[PDB]
């Protein structure tokens, strides 16, 4: 798995791979690792697929009940803390979760919270989680700026997953892109790594080690 999310001028970019493995066996290449909590909030899945799916879907139900009661959009801080407090109750039981709760509100602006099944909860600007996180971090750290355009930021997130997809044996399949704005998230398509790699190699001139 490789999942990333980073804050920038134009909001948040969320990018994930699509591979699911059981040991060496590739169970699926078409897995959705972005949970659409609601039209304004996104969550990434790493670690336990069920644990992330179930509890973030559940989180969406809590966010809905909040804004029905309070007649107001739930904050990313509050949403993330509902999840972190939940998993903390289950601490020790064996839940496996590494997720970025991503959102864009008026009072907070674009916000990303790393939430962990150990109970960790961290606000930050850039996060990478999964077996291929170190590869994605390298591309991000070297190329990241706050004043990135929405076009370039989307590419950077795509290219960083590709870097991990290539090197990490347990990452790949395809890249899912999302762009989170104040008015909601916008899906930016599924991108097969196989086709993307040759496309990027040629156009960018990178991956000279690989014969194409």
């Amino acid at each position: 798995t490789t999942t990333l999310a980073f804050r920038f001028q134009g909001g948040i970019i969320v990018a994930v791979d699509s591979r699911a493995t059981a040991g060496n066996w590739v169970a699926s290449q078409t897995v959705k690792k972005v949970i659409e909590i609601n039209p304004f909030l996104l969550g990434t899945v790493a670690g336990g697929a069920a644990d992330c799916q179930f509890w973030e879907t559940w989180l969406g139900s809590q966010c809905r009940l909040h804004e029905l009661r309070e007649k107001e959009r739930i904050s990313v801080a509050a949403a993330s803390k509902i999840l972190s407090n939940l998993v903390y109750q289950y601490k020790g039981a064996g839940l496996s979760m590494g997720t970025m709760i991503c959102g864009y509100t008026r009072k907070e602006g674009p916000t990303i919270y790393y939430v962990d099944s150990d109970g960790t909860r961290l606000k930050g600007d850039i996060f990478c989680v999964g077996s291929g996180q170190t590869f994605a971090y390298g591309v991000l750290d070297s190329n990241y700026k706050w004043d990135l355009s929405v076009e370039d930021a989307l590419y950077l997130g795509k290219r960083s997953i590709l870097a991990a997809a290539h090197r990490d044996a347990y990452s790949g399949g395809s890249v899912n892109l999302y762009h989170v704005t104040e008015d909601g998230w916008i899906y930016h398509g599924n991108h097969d790594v196989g086709e993307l790699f040759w496309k990027v190699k040629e156009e960018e001139g990178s991956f000279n080690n690989v014969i194409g």
Binding site: W25, T30, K32, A49, A50, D51, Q53, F54, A93
Partner: protein, 222 residues
Amino acid sequence: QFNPYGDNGGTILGIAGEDFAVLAGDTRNITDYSINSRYEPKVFDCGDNIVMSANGFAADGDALVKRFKNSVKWYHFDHNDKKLSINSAARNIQHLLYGKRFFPYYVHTIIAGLDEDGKGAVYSFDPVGSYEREQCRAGGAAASLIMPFLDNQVNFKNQYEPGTNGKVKKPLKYLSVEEVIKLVRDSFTSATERHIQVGDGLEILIVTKDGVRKEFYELKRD
């Protein structure tokens, strides 16, 4: 020490067509190197034009199928005989499975049917309830033998159009119900040859707008 889990072998296969869906599964039931039964139905009609199979540990498989069938019944009582849609059934199954998160149903569950637009649908579940709509999914013992073949013959992976040499992919043309059944039968024939836990018989359930139809085929009994 008492081990509450066991492996009953078997292999299942769900394929979603354009306006149909098939869920196939061998009829062999085993423990270790012994055959319990050469014909023990594994794929079930659960009503509301939904078919289901919970492959792996047969006791948990049977328990889950029983509980889901029961869920369909109580969905009708509580909601004015409303038809349970395949997507709703899928979410309901997630909650059944995750309900035993810390003592899981040791099964790989697959359901098949038609979505609310009439198109073919297959849903795949892990033992603890993570699920996804899929076009093609083999489950169980010989899943690793079948899925690569399906990637190649259903989705035309790694296949390119002659003359272009790797520049133009083979187009993803729609398969008919007769064409899918051929691939299902050849998948199980091949799995029977190379996997010891697969054999005896193949039972296929075909779901269309007209209803649920069954087809049975012999497999090698060695």
